[PDB]
Paper text:
The human [name] ([name]) is a key regulator of chromosome segregation during mitosis, through its essential biological functions in chromosome condensation, cohesin dissociation from chromosomes, mitotic entry, centrosome maturation, kinetochore function, spindle assembly, and exit from mitosis. The [name] recognizes phospho (p)Ser/Thr protein substrates for the kinase catalytic activity of PLKs12. Intriguingly, recent crystallographic studies have identified a hydrophobic pocket within the human [name] [name], located adjacent to the phosphosubstrate binding groove, which may regulate substrate recognition. Seven hydrophobic amino acid residues line the pocket; whilst V415, L478, and F482 cover the bottom of the pocket, the Tyr residues Y417, Y421, Y481 and Y485, form its sides.
The pocket is evident only in certain structural conformers, suggesting that it may adopt an open conformation in which it could accommodate residues from [name] substrates, or alternatively, a closed conformation precluding such interactions. The proximity of the Tyr pocket to the phosphosubstrate binding groove, and its ability to adopt an open conformation, suggest that it may assist in the recognition of [name] substrates that contain hydrophobic side chains, enabling substrate discrimination.
Numbering used by the authors:
A (entry chain C): 401, 368 to 371
B (entry chain A): 373 to 595
The structure:
Amino acid sequence: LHSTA
Amino acid sequence: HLSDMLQQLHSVNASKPSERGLVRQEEAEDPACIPIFWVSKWVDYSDKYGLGYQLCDNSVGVLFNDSTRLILYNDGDSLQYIERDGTESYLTVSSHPNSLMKKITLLKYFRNYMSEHLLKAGANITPREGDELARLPYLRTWFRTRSAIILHLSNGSVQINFFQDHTKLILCPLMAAVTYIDEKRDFRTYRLSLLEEYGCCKELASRLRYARTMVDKLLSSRS
């Protein structure tokens, strides 16, 4: 649900 | 711009760049074609609210589920709101425009989350200087497949971020250019016509074939 952490 | 992008992709893919007798990929590089804007970060809350994103100039935007868009400029105060029907209004955060407080609150939430936790794609890269008058692009549409998220910006750019290896393509139809960010986070920009002349490695050629398929999907789902 999100881009790379 | 999508139709142009499609033709440019047909052209490079048809030249079969990874099969060149001698591939001279570096000869097709052109740092002058680096984008002005790309998506550096994103959060998919599309189950309830929508998709939030940060552009490389540190501005953020949201494409809400109700088809509206809210953009916060990098001054952290100036807002543009785009209604379903395309009407655009300029506002400020500090004015507290009551009917928008829920959307403003969500955008701030997304912004803080991206800022605290997520890597900036193309962090090393200075964006090309654009004209100061040009409007900030916003997210026109997006979708995810099993292998990538596809982000289509209103200035015509299409960006494809691959899940498995964190590689990314940013296609710019206005310059007929592509930027490829590889698995080591090295950033290379190529002119598509030069890729036709000089060829490229199998990894880039494969991703350019997938890009054509994605631009066809965008064109098939348009409005």
